[PDB]
Amino acid sequence: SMEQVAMELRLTELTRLLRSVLDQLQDKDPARIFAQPVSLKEVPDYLDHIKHPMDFATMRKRLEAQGYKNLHEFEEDFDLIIDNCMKYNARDTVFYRAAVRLRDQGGVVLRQARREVDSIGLE
Numbered sequence: 001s002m003e004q005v006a007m008e009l010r011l012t013e014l015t016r017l018l019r020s021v022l023d024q025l026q027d028k029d030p031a032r033i034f035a036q037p038v039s040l041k042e043v044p045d046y047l048d049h050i051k052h053p054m055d056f057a058t059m060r061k062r063l064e065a066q067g068y069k070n071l072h073e074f075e076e077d078f079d080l081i082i083d084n085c086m087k088y089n090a091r092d093t094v095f096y097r098a099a100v101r102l103r104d105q106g107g108v109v110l111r112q113a114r115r116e117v118d119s120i121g122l123e
């Protein structure tokens with residue numbers, strides 16, 4: 001149907017916006033601490049601590065499959081990256097501190113992203 005095509009166009013446009021958002025958020029992780037899944041070779045007990053691992057590569061996979069239907073779903077995964085890190089790692093670590101900085105700098109990007117999604121009507 002034409003209606004189905006219209007919704008699919010909206011999803012494609014949301015995906016384009018979120019790709020730009022994801023690139024901007026990842027730029028706020030210059031150490032690439034969140035670029036890939038936490039290594040279970042490096043951290044064998046990780047899944048005993050963290051029930052829903054997340055990282056930028058995993059987000060990008062979902063994104064290019066158009067697996068984010070709205071901004072909320074995308075933000076949920078971004079928040080997992082930060083929240084998982086701040087639980088597993090202590091306050092005085094480069095890991096925890098990278099998450100705090102990503103959260104703070106990322107908030108700015110996401111604030112304007114919400115306006116664009118609403119204004120254009122992408123969800």
Ligand SMILES: Cc1cc(NC(=O)C2CC2)on1
Nearest residue numbers: 032033034038043085088095
């Ligand atoms: C625990 C834990 C580890 C990480 N990140 C990394 O180790 C990437 C390679 C630098 O995030 N949380």
Ligand code: NA
Nearest residue numbers: 086087088089
């Ligand atoms: Na902790």
